[PDB]
Amino acid sequence: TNLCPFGEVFNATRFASVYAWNRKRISNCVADYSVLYNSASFSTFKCYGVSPTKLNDLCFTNVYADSFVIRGDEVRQIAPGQTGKIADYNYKLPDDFTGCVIAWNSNNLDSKVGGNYNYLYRLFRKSNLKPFERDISTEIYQAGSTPCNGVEGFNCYFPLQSYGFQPTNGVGYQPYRVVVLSFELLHAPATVCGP
């Protein structure tokens, strides 16, 4: 009985920005879903494919953890449906999702006193994303009918925009840390599942 390292993804000191969400594999474990549900620190624990109270007897071929940091308001855009902006340009969920989303407030940690800069979010893309596609590339993006010769006027704006994350805003704007678990039962021997 060798437990699996979830503690290395939830208590990590640094989380990736939304447009470059971290994507970690987990395999060859005995995952303990008891802690992840009973905990009193989360503020949004949701599961779509399988209700939380029966995760102790479902063996998956593989499991992935996505991790990132989003605005407090926009946490209502991480869902199969419920499209919008962030789910439209940065991280889109597949429609037949079988997984869970865990979002909790981190007002104290991820917000500095004078104004942070390490967190950026995408804007101004050519077309809406497709499920799970990661686009970390930065290229100067065009407004309308104008050649893009490397510089910004009323023609080509730089996509990424910077979060402020001031420590004195209302509850609707302080950062929220999000971890999305995705389960997979591909044709292979079952490895990871609870005791």
Partner: antibody, heavy 127, light 113 residues
């Protein structure tokens, strides 16, 4: 053997962009926090930026904050640095270094120990 | 936003004697764990720099046992017990506590005559 190869150097006029790339080969790229460190011509070193083991940046230097943008990719074992709105004072070599302590091997997570260094490029700016 | 200093600024050493270099900070780097986060780095003339000491005094891997690190609070020192012909170049001390990190101005070690 561990290798750290960087590319992207070349003359660039002021007020443009560049995209330096550092590729690592010979270790588990996900258990080491990378760093990008400049080196002025005939002067001392200077820390520029870094990235932890979960693609979470750790802040930039005080005088450069506002333009540089770091990014990572564990699938392709790569670390990219986009650089916008240059000035004449950003000509220097650039090394990409690796941390020493593997994560969760012993309080907090490790960030120090820039042990292995690739041979840096020679970015320059002039008109 | 932490500023260091080093001393002496430049010293000439002769092969076969120890030498001592001091790095000083502004805020004591004693973390909650009780570890000082200073690191000592070396650069040879014409090559990429290399690591000497990490975590205050824990000796780095692959370097000989001729180096020693000590100190705490806001003052740390590096001592080379038996200097030789292959110990010339520049030395730096780097913090690891409060981002952004910083490098000292650098000590220039050369051969005396």
């Amino acid at each position: 053997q561990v290798q750290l190869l960087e590319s992207g150097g070349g003359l660039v006029q002021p007020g443009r962009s560049l995209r330096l790339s550092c590729a690592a080969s010979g270790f588990t790229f996900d258990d080491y926090a990378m760093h990008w460190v400049r080196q002025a011509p005939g002067k001392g070193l200077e820390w520029v930026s870094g990235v932890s083991w979960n693609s979470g940046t750790i802040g930039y230097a005080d005088s450069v904050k506002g333009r540089f943008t770091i990014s990572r990719d564990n699938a392709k074992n790569s670390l990219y640095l986009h650089m916008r709105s240059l000035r004449a004072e950003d000509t220097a070599l650039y090394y990409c270094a690796k941390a020493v302590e593997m994560v969760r091997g012993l309080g907090a997570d490790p960030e120090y120990g820039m042990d292995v260094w690739g041979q840096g490029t020679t970015v320059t700016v002039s008109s | 936003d932490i500023v260091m200093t080093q001393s002496p600024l430049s010293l000439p050493v002769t092969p076969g004697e120890p030498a001592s270099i001091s790095c000083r900070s502004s805020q004591s780097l004693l973390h909650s764990n009780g570890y000082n986060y200073l690191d000592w780095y070396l650069q040879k003339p014409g090559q990429s720099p290399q690591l000497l000491i990490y975590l205050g005094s824990n000796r780095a891997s692959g370097v000989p046992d001729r180096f020693s690190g000590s100190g705490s609070g806001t003052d740390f020192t590096l001592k080379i017990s038996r200097v030789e012909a292959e110990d010339v170049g520049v030395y730096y001390c780097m913090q690891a506590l409060q981002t952004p990190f910083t490098f000292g101005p650098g000590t220039k070690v050369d051969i005396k005559r």
